[PDB]
């Protein structure tokens, strides 16, 4: 199972931190709100990191 194909995970913490995830339906790295803890792997600090890791999934 490709972690790049998992939906983005906000998690239980209550921050509003903007992260990137690869959106395989759109074929692009997109922003989402991360709550600050228990990140899954489809969660990147920049578009560049997301594209490097997941681009083309």
């Amino acid at each position: 199972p490709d972690f790049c194909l998992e939906p983005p995970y906000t998690g239980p913490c209550x921050a509003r931190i903007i992260r990137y995830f690869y959106n395989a339906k759109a074929g692009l790295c997109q922003t989402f709100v991360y709550g600050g803890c228990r990140a899954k792997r489809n969660n990147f600090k920049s578009a560049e990191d997301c594209m490097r890791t997941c681009g083309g999934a």
Partner: protein, 223 residues
């Protein structure tokens, strides 16, 4: 904050916003040089914004001061969320005034049923997303450790408490983390985590500040 109300400009003068190019967490001012927030709010390059009401506009009472130190509790566990507290030192001292003021640390823990004030610029919807311009407030009670553990089996440590309403509708939410839970003029909690926002049977979980008072005072004094 879901299910709350507009506080009114500068009515919660200890509330700060943590900014990293946008608002991502709250915090509480505890003296002119130091803020308490959550450990999961750690980021490099934090700017603390004091005296805010509308966080999308420059209104006239703001002070924007960079963090010079952002000190996460040395036993923070990023998996269990135990010890979810962080101290931020301001690079220069805030100018204290009626709209920028410190909140007292507790002298003893608060009991179940004590009514508190929770505040922040987090999401106001339990389903969907709406982020407010102005600061929101919620009155909510501390809940018993037993009810908290029943809501979240295996997850509640001695350094956490639950607060809120089991019927749903009133809770902290994304963007409120790090901010205050104040009870009878004392900072008793820090917004930490939950399960969704404002859902039935899923109250918010808060860092139990009364357990950290000695650590907070000594860490501040040592830095």
């Amino acid at each position: 904050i879901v299910g709350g109300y507009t506080c009114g400009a500068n009515t919660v003068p200890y509330q700060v916003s943590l900014n990293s190019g946008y608002h991502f967490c709250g915090g509480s001012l505890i003296n002119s040089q130091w803020v308490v927030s959550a450990a999961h709010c750690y980021k490099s390059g934090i700017q603390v914004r004091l005296g805010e009401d509308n966080i999308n506009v420059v209104e006239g009472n703001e002070q924007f001061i960079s963090a010079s130190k952002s000190i996460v509790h040395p036993s923070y566990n990023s998996n269990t969320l135990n010890n979810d507290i962080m101290l931020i030192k301001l690079k220069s001292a805030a100018s204290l005034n009626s709209r920028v003021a410190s909140i007292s640390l507790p002298t003893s823990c608060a009991s179940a049923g004590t009514q508190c004030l929770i505040s922040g610029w987090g999401n106001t919807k339990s389903s969907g997303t709406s982020y407010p311009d102005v600061l929101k407030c919620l009155k909510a009670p501390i809940l018993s450790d037993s009810s908290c553990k029943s809501a979240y089996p295996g997850q509640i440590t001695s350094n956490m408490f639950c607060a809120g309403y089991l019927e749903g509708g009133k809770d902290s939410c994304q963007g409120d983390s790090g901010g205050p839970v104040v009870c009878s003029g004392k900072l008793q909690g820090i917004v930490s985590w939950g399960s969704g926002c404002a859902q039935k049977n899923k109250p918010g979980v808060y860092t139990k500040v009364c357990n950290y008072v000695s650590w907070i005072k000594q860490t501040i004094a040592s830095n």
